[PDB]
């Protein structure tokens, strides 16, 4: 550890930014769609649409983990702490050559294969009372996913009923305890963003997740289920995160598409609701890529040498 | 199960421009890419283009770039196709043909090269 | 730049007989081909596609076979109907050239 107290602000972080530009680039000469759009403005209202035209090879999209180290008159420094906002005079920082393996995972309401919590489940947010900021959940117990191509992933409804618990607990021990904590799905938006989406063998999976974010701090669900089964869905034409425009990708072709995830993470999103009766609806959220970049350098930033 | 309707046969004059019309009915729209498929009398086949309508993109035959567009009017339900400096050679009959996609309406598309769905062919003379 | 020959520029037989199409390809346009069947004066007909699959509501004589740049519209006991020019379509590169085999007729040996 290094014997200093500095500042850190992953929601201001800069590697975030630097990873995120790489996590494109590491798209755009494995994952290049048939053809892909994107606005073209002159600022006079009309808007040309931009269109690129190119070869569509079925690569089965397999992440490889990502170190980040400094290369010379640059140190990155790591912040200790069990329960770390993130954003504040961290004390037990200590300087590192490269920040751990990292598996550049895009996705949206659900982070995968991330870090776990250390200690407990911990939830960071640029603004808790911001209802526009996102809440990024972290879980210190990650909940297996499945999902197949054959349009599904399972999960366990034990596990994910407990998540829940030990998430909405976490949260009103943020937004005051006497309060009442409710999950609900996405309100509305992109398919990317309403439903679980992310890419599995180099197909873009769009999961409803409304069995996942339905969730009354009273009642259950678990009749005659075992497993959570959310209805997923493959699609070929998208909206990009990389940059505003579609992008259609050639149909799946391989016998067999698989995916099984940890799910390390959340990225919650409080509805306002005006200060009324303690009842935070919390729903979905996410398609901001560099959130989840976040989730994982939140305890990281880069210095120049002394 | 589309029915793919045209627009009259036309007598274009050489260095001119013709527009043909494709009427799409019995189905969803968006959910078919359609194709013009022109035939020189005694002639054969020859690809002319495919518009991935729902995309508004539209992709075309390397002889005809240029000179040839294809666009679709999804609030009336019209596909058509435009060739512009017309020569005697591109005296033929166009052809419009579609085929399904899939739920295009909902980010499935198998981008089809095969062509299901015909019309019943409009004939162009581009003579002086 | 993809070339689809259709070497049986003419093909006389009779009906009842089996007739065999042969569709020679350029490169490999893998299993990315479809046949069609021309009546004069009227728009093609989609016999064949993938190959190898029937299109909805056709002829179980027609035999589509193939992959890669050898495909074949192979059929049993031919009809009258059954006559017609076929074509052999080619839709595998993209960006989309797709380009069409020049024909073969399948006229009535007598």
């Known amino acids: 550890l290094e014997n200093v107290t500095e500042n850190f602000n992953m929601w201001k972080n800069n590697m975030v930014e630097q990873m995120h530009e790489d996590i494109i680039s590491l798209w755009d000469q494995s994952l290049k769609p048939c053809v892909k759009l994107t606005p073209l403005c002159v600022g006079a209202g009309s808007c040309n649409t931009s269109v690129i035209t190119q070869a569509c090879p079925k690569v089965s999209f397999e992440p490889i983990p990502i170190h980040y180290c400094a290369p010379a008159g640059f140190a990155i420094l790591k912040c200790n702490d069990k329960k770390f906002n993130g954003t504040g005079p961290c004390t037990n920082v200590s300087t590192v050559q490269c920040t751990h393996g990292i598996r550049p995972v895009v996705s949206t309401q659900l982070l995968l294969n991330g870090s776990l919590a250390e200690e407990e489940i911990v939830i960071r947010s640029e603004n808790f009372t911001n209802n526009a900021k996102t809440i990024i959940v972290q879980l210190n117990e990650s909940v297996v996913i499945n999902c197949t191509g054959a349009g599904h992933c399972n999960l366990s409804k034990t596990q994910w009923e407990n998540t829940l618990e030990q998430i909405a607990i976490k949260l009103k021990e943020q937004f005051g305890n006497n309060k009442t904590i409710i999950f609900n799905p996405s309100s509305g938006g992109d398919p990317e963003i309403v439903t679980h989406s992310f890419n599995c063998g180099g197909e873009f999976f769009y999961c409803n997740s409304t069995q996942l974010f339905t969730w009354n701090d009273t009642r259950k669900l678990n009749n005659t289920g075992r497993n959570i089964t959310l209805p997923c869905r493959i699609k070929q034409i998208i909206n990009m995160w990389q940059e505003v425009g579609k992008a259609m990708y050639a149909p799946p072709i391989r016998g067999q598409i698989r995916c099984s995830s940890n799910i390390t993470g959340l990225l919650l999103t409080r509805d306002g609701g005006k200060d009324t009766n303690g009842t935070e609806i919390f729903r979905p959220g996410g398609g901001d890529m560099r959130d989840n970049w976040r989730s994982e350098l939140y305890k990281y930033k880069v210095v120049k040498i002394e | 199960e589309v029915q793919l309707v045209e627009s009259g046969a036309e007598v274009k004059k050489p260095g001119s421009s013709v527009k043909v019309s494709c009427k799409a009915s019995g189905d969803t729209f968006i959910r078919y890419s359609f194709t013009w498929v022109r035939q020189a009398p005694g002639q054969g086949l020859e690809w002319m283009g495919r518009?991935?309508?729902?995309?508004?993109?539209?992709h075309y035959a390397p002889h005809l770039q240029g000179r040839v567009t294809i666009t679709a009017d999804k609030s009336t339900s019209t596909v058509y196709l435009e060739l512009r400096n017309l020569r005697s050679d591109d005296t033929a009959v166009y052809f419009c043909?579609?085929?399904?996609?899939?739920?295009?309406?909902?980010?499935?598309?198998?981008?089809?090269?095969?062509?299901?769905?015909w019309g019943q062919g409009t004939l162009v003379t581009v003579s002086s | 730049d993809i070339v689809m020959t259709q070497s049986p520029a003419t093909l006389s037989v009779s009906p009842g007989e089996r007739a065999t199409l042969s569709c020679r390809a350029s490169?490999?346009?893998?299993?990315?081909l479809a046949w069609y069947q021309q009546k004069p004066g009227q728009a093609p007909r989609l016999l064949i596609y993938?190959?190898?699959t029937r299109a909805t509501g056709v002829p179980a004589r027609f035999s589509g076979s193939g992959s890669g740049a050898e495909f074949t519209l192979t059929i049993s006991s031919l009809q009258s109907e059954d006559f017609a020019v076929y074509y052999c379509?080619?839709?595998?590169?993209?960006?989309?050239?797709?380009?069409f085999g020049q024909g073969t007729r399948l006229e009535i040996k007598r």
């Open positions: 043909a579609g085929v399904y996609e899939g739920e295009a309406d909902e980010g499935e598309y198998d981008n089809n090269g095969f062509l299901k769905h």
């Open positions: 379509q080619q839709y595998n590169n993209w960006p989309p050239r797709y380009t």
């Open positions: 518009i991935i309508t729902i995309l508004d993109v539209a």
């Open positions: 993938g190959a190898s």
């Open positions: 490169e490999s346009v893998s299993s990315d």
